[PDB]
Amino acid sequence: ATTFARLCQQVDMTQKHLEEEIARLSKEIDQLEKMQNNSKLLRNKAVQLESELENFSKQFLH
């Protein structure tokens, strides 16, 4: 009924919402770090493969 209780509830709901937001965003951030690391892996593989191609070429086409 009181301003105090009204505020206690508002603050509690807001706290819960922020905590969930922060928890979800942290998880999502982790997932995105992983997708980025994976893409670098694939990209690095492709660059290695490309330098192997050039070694092959310098030997058999030049």
Add this chain to the structure above:
Amino acid sequence: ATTFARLCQQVDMTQKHLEEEIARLSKEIDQLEKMQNNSKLLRNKAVQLESELENFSKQFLH
């Protein structure tokens, strides 16, 4: 017709494929860096908002 020409073509197709792979992955990596930076922004906002909530609370509920 010759082994040489057959290999020239294979190497050329493979080079093109690797270049596109590397180009696409770089773009995707950039996009993922951006999504991650954005998530940190939102997450930081939420943490700031949370410490503002606690200041509000320490003043009006304690």
